[PDB]
């Protein structure tokens, strides 16, 4: 009985992989372009981070010296 009910649980699927394969290709292209966007915005990010880091460093040494 368990095997029977599991056979009913079984959803019918096309043995042909064309639909799946096409889905696959869409996802790969999609993650590719999203990865490019991430890369551009990530280089700009790290540049920004360097800038703010310099301003930080000025602050820290200046503050320490002046108050102490």
């Amino acid at each position: 009985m368990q095997i029977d009910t599991l056979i009913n649980q079984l959803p019918g699927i096309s043995t042909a992989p064309k639909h799946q394969l096409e889905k696959i290709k869409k996802l790969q292209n999609s993650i590719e372009e999203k990865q490019l966007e991430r890369k551009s915005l990530e280089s700009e990010n790290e540049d920004l981070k360097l800038q703010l880091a310099k301003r930080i460093e000025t602050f820290g040494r200046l503050s320490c010296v002046l108050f102490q």
């Binding site: 696959i24 290709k25 790969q28 993650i31 590719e32 990865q35």
Partner: protein, 31 residues
């Protein structure tokens, strides 16, 4: 067919090792 797919083990989840490496690559730290 065969198309290249890009995946980088995103499912899977130290400076002491860094130190030891740099210690072997430029010897002493002080310099």
């Amino acid at each position: 067919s065969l198309d290249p797919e890009i995946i980088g083990g995103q499912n899977n989840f130290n400076l002491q090792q860094i130190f030891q490496k740099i210690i072997q690559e430029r010897g002493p730290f002080r310099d």
